[PDB]
C-alpha cells in the first residue's frame, strides 16, 4: 500500500524524461503556409516521442518491426495526451511544444475539419475533470506505448508483460493520491479508449487533406499514410 | 470487502440473460444458406448467421436493468456501436485454442482459412484472431464476461448520444461489482482487473477495422443485409426490434 523503491525510480526516470519533450520555445531559434506550420512542429513532437520511448525500459530489447509497430500507432495518441495536459480551460487554447497555442479557429484556417477538432478539444476537457498530475500522464504514456492490440505486432505476449509494471505503478500510485476514490483509476483507463477513436477519426483527417493537395512531409508519411527508411534512422542513432 | 446482496442478484441475472443468447445450432430448427459466387455463398451465410446475433443482443440489452429507460435514439446509438464489440467479445469466449476455430451461435465453427475464402482481408481477419487468445491469456470466467458486455453496452462515448451522464450512471454500478469480484475471485491478482477495462480499448480498433472490411466488400459485389446495413454501413428495422 505504499510505492515500492523501484516504482519511485520509474515514475522519477518518466517524468525527466517527459521534461525533455516540449523545451523549444516561440522565440527560441527559427490557409496553405498554415498547415505546412503544424507539419513542422509535429515532427519535432514525433521525433521527441522517439526519443523518450528508447529512455522506457524494455523498449529498445524489443525487435525492430515492434518497435516501428507501437511508435506508429502511439505517436499520435501521445500528443492527444500533451495537448489535454496543458489545455488552458479559460482561453479555449491548444498548447504545443512549448509556446505554441492555438484556439479552434486556427485549426479551421488550416484546412482541419469540425468532425476532428470538436473531439480533440472535448477530450482535452474531458481529461481536466479528471485532475491529473505529470506522474500520471506519464505511466499512461508508457501504457499506451506498450500496447499489445496494435497492428503488426509480431510479439504480443512480450508488449503485454513490458506494460504490466507501469499498470501496477499506476494502480498504487492512484490508490495513495485517492484512497477514498476506488474508481478514479478506471476512469483514466477508459481514456485509453478514447484515445483509439480520435486517432481513427485523425486517420479519417489526414486523407481528406491529401484531396485538398496537402501531403504530409517525409517523417509524418511514414507513420500515418495509407519500410520506415527515416523511422529506422531514429532509432538507429 | 465481500459483495453486496444487489451485486450478486445483478451479476447472476445477466449470466442467466447470456445464456439464452447462441442456443442456435447447425442440426437445430430451420437450415442457414449453406456452406460449401462459392466466396458468395459464404458472404451470405455468415450475414445470416451475424443477423441472427445481433437480434439476440437486442433482446438482451433490453432486459438489462436501465436500458429500457434510456431515450430510444439513445438505446439505438448505443447498440450502433456496441453490437460488433459484443460479438468479438462472444468469439473470443469460445474461441478454441486447440483448433484455432471460432465459433458462432452454438456450434457454426470455422477456421481463419474459411473466413479467407469468403472475402475477408487479413487487416480485419489477424486481429480478431489474435484477440481471441490475447483474452485466454487473461482467462475471464461467465461472470467476468458478463460484466464487461454490461460495461460496453453503457459507454458514453458514442456517437450520437444525447443523454452521456446518464448513459454513465448506468455503467458505473456495473463497473463497481467488476471491481469487487475480481477483487474476491483472485485478491492477489490485481493486475487482472485493469486488463480486462482495457480490452475495451481494443474493442474500438476492432470495430473501426470491422467498418473498414464491411466497405472493402462492397467492391467485391457482396452487399449487407437490411438490418446489418442499418448498423454498420455508411433504423426502421432495429426501431421495430426494440418495441415488443
Ligand atoms: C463478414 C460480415 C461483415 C458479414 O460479418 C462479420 O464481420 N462477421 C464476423 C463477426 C460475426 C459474429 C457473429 C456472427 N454470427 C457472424 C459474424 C460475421
Not at 43 to 58: H, L, N, R, T, Y
Not at 169 to 185: E, G, H, N, V, W
Amino acid at each position: 500500500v505504499q510505492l515500492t523503491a523501484a516504482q519511485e525510480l520509474m515514475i522519477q526516470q518518466l517524468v525527466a524524461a517527459q521534461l525533455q519533450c516540449n523545451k523549444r520555445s516561440f522565440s527560441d531559434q527559427p490557409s496553405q503556409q498554415r498547415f505546412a506550420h503544424f507539419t513542422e512542429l509535429a515532427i519535432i513532437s514525433v521525433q521527441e516521442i522517439v526519443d523518450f520511448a528508447k529512455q522506457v525500459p524494455g523498449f529498445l530489447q524489443l525487435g525492430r518491426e515492434d518497435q516501428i509497430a507501437l511508435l506508429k500507432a502511439s505517436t499520435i495518441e501521445i500528443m492527444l495526451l500533451e495537448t489535454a495536459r496543458r489545455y488552458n480551460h479559460e482561453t479555449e487554447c491548444i498548447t504545443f511544444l512549448k509556446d505554441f497555442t492555438y484556439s479552434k479557429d486556427d485549426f479551421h484556417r488550416a484546412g482541419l475539419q469540425v468532425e476532428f477538432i470538436n473531439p480533440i478539444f472535448e477530450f482535452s476537457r474531458a481529461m481536466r475533470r479528471l485532475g491529473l498530475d505529470d506522474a500520471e500522464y506519464a505511466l499512461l504514456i508508457a501504457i499506451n506505448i506498450f500496447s499489445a492490440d496494435r497492428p503488426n505486432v509480431q510479439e504480443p505476449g512480450r508488449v503485454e508483460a513490458l506494460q504490466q509494471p507501469y499498470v501496477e505503478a499506476l494502480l498504487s500510485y492512484t490508490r495513495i493520491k485517492r484512497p477514498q476514490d476506488q474508481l478514479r483509476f478506471p476512469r483514466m483507463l477508459m481514456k485509453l479508449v478514447s484515445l483509439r477513436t480520435l486517432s481513427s477519426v485523425h486517420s479519417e483527417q489526414v486523407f481528406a487533406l491529401r484531396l485538398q493537395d496537402k501531403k504530409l512531409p517525409p517523417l509524418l508519411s511514414e507513420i500515418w499514410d495509407v519500410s520506415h527508411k527515416i523511422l529506422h534512422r531514429l532509432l538507429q542513432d
